[model samples]
Each structure stands twice: as C-alpha cells, then as structure tokens.
Target chain A: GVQALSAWTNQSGSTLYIQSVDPSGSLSGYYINRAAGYGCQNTPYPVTGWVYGTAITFTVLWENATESCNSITAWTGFYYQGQITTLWQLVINGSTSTGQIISGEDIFKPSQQKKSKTLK
Target chain B: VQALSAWTNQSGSTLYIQSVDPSGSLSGYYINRAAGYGCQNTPYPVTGWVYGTAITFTVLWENATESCNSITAWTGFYYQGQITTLWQLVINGSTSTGQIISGEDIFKPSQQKKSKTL
Candidate 1:
C-alpha cells in the first residue's frame, strides 16, 4: 500500500526504461543508476529513468488486481561524456490499495538547453 | 508548536540517539542522519552516554507578558544506536486554564534495552 515519490539525478551513466502495471496484472521493468533512487515503496519516490532518443513509451491502461493496487509509467537516460543530454519526460498516474493511496498526473523533466533561441 | 517531519537512512557511520523530557523536566539528546541533515539547533548535541528517543517536545506553561501555553510531541528512529523506534508519538492532552497545550505519554521506558550508546 505504498508507492509515491519519484526522484532523478544523473551522476554519469544513463540508459533506462520502466513500465509498471499493478492491481494483479503484474508487469515490471527496471534500469536506473545515477545518484540512485527509485520507485514503488508505498507508491511515490525517487523514480529516475528516461532516455527517449530512440525508445520510450507510456500507454498505461491495463488493470486486474485483487488487493495491493498498482500503476506506473517511466523513461530515463542522461549521459555525461560525449555531452549527451535528455531528461525530457516523466509522467505518473497512481492508485494503490490495502491501505489506500491516490494520485494522478505528476510530471518533471524540462531542463538543460544552454543555448537555443527562437521566440521573437 | 505543531510542525514536524522525520526520516532516517542509516548506512555505516552509526550515531542515532534522540531525547526530550520536558513537562518542566528539561532534558535533550541527539545523533541522527547518515545521508544529509542533522540538528538540535546545534545547541542540542550528545556524546557517549545516550538514552532518549523523542523529537519535538516544546513545553511552556508560563513565559510571556501575560502567561502563555505551548506543547508538542513528535518521535522517530528505527534503530541505529539501540532502542527508540517510534516514528510519531503525539500526546497533547489538554485540560485548559487560559493558554493551554498539554499531552504526555512515554509513561515509562527508562530501561528496556538498557540504553548506553557511544
């Protein structure tokens, strides 16, 4: 009945992806390590993972659980050596049971673009 | 005095002991965190002899221009130095007089795990 607290901090390595579905359907995925902090405790926490320059998707809509609820969508990737950068999207839609928790649409990622001008 | 929060992430460098005993019996203790964040206003620090685990206890029955009242109770710690794993134990029982804030519980725990941390 716990899951809510998503965090991100790239210390160096990146290339991650995650897609979670709970309520009993049982779907899982993982690959994250920058400053090291991840999701699904009571529900929300330090969920750092996204690198959509090639593959990343969030199509959460599949439910079938009996007790301990679940729902998650993730994507992450951020490099440092060759000057790679991308922390484009992180979206969350939540619900958990057993003790009960609720959340919908929590987003982060839209930074790093030192020089680029267009609007006038 | 109602504003409190708690969290602990222990790894290696062990140092966890918190204390507060004030109904008019002022006492203090400290030692927490292994992952950023520690305080006691820097005015409440403990050394080798430690045995107290309850954070957030502000008691006041009289200390104003016209008599004031304040009370608080908050606790945390899952174990680092030994004993004291209360995440939140609030007790503010009231009986009111004019300026009132009351609550107490720790009924007793002076010894159970025999606290003597260093």
Candidate 2:
C-alpha cells in the first residue's frame, strides 16, 4: 500500500521535473523551486538539498497510494521515515522509482548546509 | 483517561451512559435510548440476514469504538476467544454520547413485514 519513488542522475547539468499521476490517471507536477513550502500538503521541508557522490534520502509519506495510478506526487518527495536521518529526502526529477544519491551542487548546494541534525 | 464499564442488557435493552463533560464548566446535557443494539458498532452477522433491516450484530469481544466517547469498536469481525461471542449491537439507549438513539427500534419485530430502512 506504501512505496517510495527514486531516481539516479549522473548528468552534471541536467534538470529533472517532478509529477504525480493519481488513480484517475490525472497528472500533477511541482516546478523546481528554492523553497520547501511550495507543495500541496504542508508539514516539514521537502529536501535538505541534493548532494553529489553521497546519497540524499527523503522520508516519503504515503498519500494512500493504492495502485500504479494512485501514488503520491511522483517526482516530488515520497514521504518516508528514514533509518539514517541525513540520508532522507524526496527524490527530485530523475527517473525510475529506485532512489539514487545526488552529487555536488547539481542538486544540493554544499554551501547552503544546515547544522548536523541531532535526534533525541 | 478513557474509562468504560461492561454491562449486560438483562432487560433486553442495553444502556449507554456517557460523561464527555466531566466538569460542569463544559457543555454536555445528553440523554438517549434504544431497544436493540446498544450503539453505532457494526453487526458481525454470522448467519444470513436481510441487509437493509437494522440488526444488532454481536461484538464477540469486549471492544470499544470511536463512535462513542471514551469507547471505540473497530472495522471487520473478530473472534474474541471468550465464553460469549463479542458483538456490535445497535440497541435503544445505546448511543449515550450523541444522544441519538431513542425509544424507536432500528429493526421491526421479527414477525412484522420488512420495511425499507434508512
């Protein structure tokens, strides 16, 4: 009933677009943006920023994804609770449902880094 | 702080008393009654029965339900592995929370002809 969508991008300067196909076969996509408050539902931020070499993970939440047509936002973040905190994030517009790690500033800018998160 | 008490419908009518407003400062003036199933829980009809007609299905287990305050029963039928089968009954005076169930019965007497149910 729940699944995460992922993609692998080896391109140095290519852009990936995110979109969702609902059960009705209706499609919805999120344009590339710098802010996390740009999606349908509001809660936490969508991504920490895609990085090069290392994998960035996203905790994709289930919007009651029943079948192929009934999935959450496709290219957006697949809400999930992660085992490793830093490895979590929604996969941007890559390709395929298998999550892949991003490298360099192509996805995540290393300069705009947040302090290492400490979990209780 | 949800508390409940198990009671038998000896008079053939189960009674449900609720206390949503523990303090007089809160708004809770409630009263209700029914003669069949005790509350809004679903029926676990083991035997074939008419669908539209209102009937009290046994809970088969001592469970609670969100339909009633502080008490909750859930989806699907379950065997409680107890001496008596648990059932979700819809009886008079059962829904004590919303004060909905009244002297009227959801089901007509078994002998009466079937009527279209709401």
Candidate 3:
C-alpha cells in the first residue's frame, strides 16, 4: 500500500523522490544518482518499478539520459520497520550482455519531505 | 550447460534453464506473466544456483516495454516427475511503503526451450 508520497535516502546520500503508485503495483518516481562520491551534481532521473503487497523495486536507466554516467540501475527490496531495504544492481560501461555489471546493498531510510519539522 | 529442461507454473509463466556451471553458478530465463493474461513474451534474466538437486534462483523483473522492476526469487528442488519452488515477489508503490507476496509454485517437467538467444 504505497499510498503516501514519500522520500528516502541511501547510505551514499542518493535520494529517491517517489511520485505515485498505481493500484496495479506500478511505481513511478525519480531518483538522484549520488553514488560516485560527493560534489557530483544530483540530477533527478525518471524511475520505473513495481510494488506488490512490502516487496518493491524500481529502476533508472541512464542510457541516453542527460547525465555524465551511463548505466542502468535497479533497486529491489522490501519494507520493514518503516525503512526500505534494497539490493541494487547497475550495468555500466557496457550492457549485461557484455558482463559490465556491479551490485551492492543499499538501505534507504525515511529522510525529509519538503516541509516537515524534525525530519528524520 | 543445459543441465535441465524448461518448467511451467500454473499461471503459464515458463522458466528455462540455460546452463549451470560445475561450481553451482546457474543462469536461466524466465518468461513471466504479464497483464491481460499474456506472457512477457521476452526472456528475463534469472541468476542463482543449482546445488545438487536443490535449485534456487532469482529473476529481476526489468525491461523497456513491459517491465515492473520487481525482485522475484524462487527456492525449491527438482525431484521425481516435478520441480517445486516457493516463490516470493517484492514490489514498491507510491501511496504506501510497499508489500511482499509469496506462494508455492509447483512446476511440471517440460520440453527443452531452444530459443534463439539466452
């Protein structure tokens, strides 16, 4: 029931601004790719994913995107204790067919949402 | 390579076992169910393992056309006359945090899926 518009932040400071969720489990949102250390501009990339019953996943394909880094990334995980736990996979430099892939774990917790006092 | 043939679940989603290395690295394809009672029609990547007769794998549902970007994992075994798996799907939504659904998927042994690509 991903009904509320929410925001999440990963360990690397990447942010996910979820826009909407269709009843059919389709999750539409935007994310900032900040995994390349700091000082890099955080550009909002359109994301697409699906949500069924606590399990959820989404992706931001950087192919032909307006960003310096070129990669196709997906985050898949479940919600627990008000936090989103995910494992992310990225295909950079080349496609999966070329074996240019990397994977890691990312824990996204509730961050801030526009205007909220004492945001966590 | 080609350690086993394909398998079909009750809902018509088919799983094709492409190959499995001796070190237990398994790779395959999954033609999952789509909307309107149709299959994805395209093979999605399936990664995991086949340790002895205990087969477990994961498929990341992502694509350009009919993609839902969900993580679907199956854990089960291949036994006499049948291949069984307890599958789970995790999806995130907009209005809520997210959800997880699971069920047992018992598949039948079927013919080999000889596709043009893996």
| lDDT winner between candidates 1 and 2 | 1
TM-score of 2: 0.14
Residue A22 lDDT in model 1? 38
DockQ of each: 0.01, 0.01, 0.09
Query: After superposition, which runs of candidate 1 have C-alpha atoms over 4 Å from their true positions?
Result: A1-9, A12-29, A33-73, A76-84, A95-120, B1-118
Interface RMSD of 3: 11.1
Model 3: per-residue Cα lDDT over B1-118, one tens digit each: 2456688888778888888776455667788764543227877766654544555566756554666645676655566666566655665342232355556677786764478976
Runs in model 2 with CA error above 4 Å? A1-38, A41-53, A62-106, A112-120, B1-118
Question: Per-residue lDDT of B11-48 in model 1, one digit per residue for the tens?
Answer: 22222234222221213332222244222122222211
Q: Which candidate leads in lDDT?
A: 3
- Tens digits of per-residue lDDT, candidate 2, A49-83, equal 11111122121211212211111121111111321
Per-residue lDDT for B1-118 in model 2, tens only? 0112112232333222122122100111111233443433332111111111111111211123322211111111111211111112222222122221112112111122457994
Ranked candidates, highest lDDT first: 3, 1, 2
lDDT (C-alpha) at residue B87 in model 1: 16
